[PDB]
Amino acid sequence: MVLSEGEWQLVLHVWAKVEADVAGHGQDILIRLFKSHPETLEKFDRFKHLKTEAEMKASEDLKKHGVTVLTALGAILKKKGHHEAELKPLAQSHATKHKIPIKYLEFISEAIIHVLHSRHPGNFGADAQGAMNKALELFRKDIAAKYKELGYQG
Ligand code: HEM
Ligand SMILES: [Cl-]
Ligand SMILES: [Cl-]
């Protein structure tokens, strides 16, 4: 699909709040992902030893990865649909090395939306959540298209 400039601004206005503390947002989002869909944690050989929420919260390496993930996602969002360059290496690594299905990308999208809804009601009302959903749908659509080009089922 194609987002309007108005929709991109709702996206960027809540992302500006995320950037006050991306490490804290990253922790919340990965922990939510793992709690709501435990099967996703099994894709991280580096983190699947983390047994509880408390262990996850105290993991500096998990925190580090959350900052890496949200900073990569933020760079894609800021391109406002012109994100082919950002998507190529991400798609290749997640298709061929990590083996991450599109359904799992849907799971983390859900986790992102849940955490933004929880932390930022002032910037994440119905219209803004709609715009974020649209942006994440666009991201997943384009990743899916790359997966097909790369030979991966998704
Ligand atoms: C918003 C969606 C996501 C973004 C932007 C993202 C971004 C990244 C980035 C930038 C890296 C490091 C560079 C690389 O290997 O490509 C990475 C690594 C990785 N990601 Fe993703 N990721 C996303 C979703 C997921 C999901 C849903 C899973 C699986 C449940 C996943 C599993 C992994 C794994 C296993 C690694 C290697 C981690 C390690 O052992 O160091 N990612 N991701
Ligand atoms: Cl600001
Ligand atoms: Cl901390």
Concatenated DSSP letters of the chain: ----HHHHHHHHHHHHHHTTSHHHHHHHHHHHHHHH-GGGGGG-TTTTT--SHHHHHH-HHHHHHHHHHHHHHHHHHHTTT--HHHHHHHHHIIIIIS---HHHHHHHHHHHHHHHHHH-GGG-SHHHHHHHHHHHHHHHHHHHHHHHHHT---
Contacts of 23 (CB under 8 A, 6+ apart): 63, 66, 67
The dihedral formed by the CA atoms of 140, 120, 21 and 23, expressed in degrees to the nearest 10: -50
- Resolution, given in Å to one decimal, reads 1.7
* Protein residues whose CB sits closer than 6 Å to any atom of ligand 1: 40, 43-44, 46, 68-69, 72-73, 90, 93-94, 98, 100, 104-105, 108
Tokens of 25: 């947002």
Q: How was this structure determined?
A: X-ray
The dihedral formed by the CA atoms of 4, 92, 110 and 132, expressed in degrees to the nearest 10: -10
User: Rounded CA gap, 71 and 77, in Å?
Assistant: 10
- Which residue among 100, 133, 141 has the greatest number of ligand 1 atoms within 8 angstroms of its CB, and so is best to mutate? 100
State the burial class of residue 46 (Cβ atoms within 10 Å of its Cβ: 0-12, 13-18, 19+): exposed
Whose Cα sits closest to atom 31 in ligand 1? 100
Closest CA to 77 of 116, 33, 24: 116
Does residue 80 contact residue 138 with C-beta atoms inside 8 Å?
no
- Which atom of ligand 1 is closest in space to residue 40's alpha carbon? 30
All structural domains of the chain, each given as residue ranges with its CATH number in brackets, are: 1-154 (1.10.490.10)
Closest CA to 3 of 141, 144, 134: 134
User: Rounded CA gap, 99 and 67, in Å?
Assistant: 21
Closest CA to 4 of 140, 127, 146, 145: 127
Closest ligand, as measured to the CA of 62: 1
Four-residue CA torsion sign, 60, 61, 63, 64: positive
Does residue 96 contact residue 150 with C-beta atoms inside 8 Å?
yes
User: Rounded CA gap, 148 and 154, in Å?
Assistant: 8
Please identify which residue in the block is written with the tokens 């930022």: 120
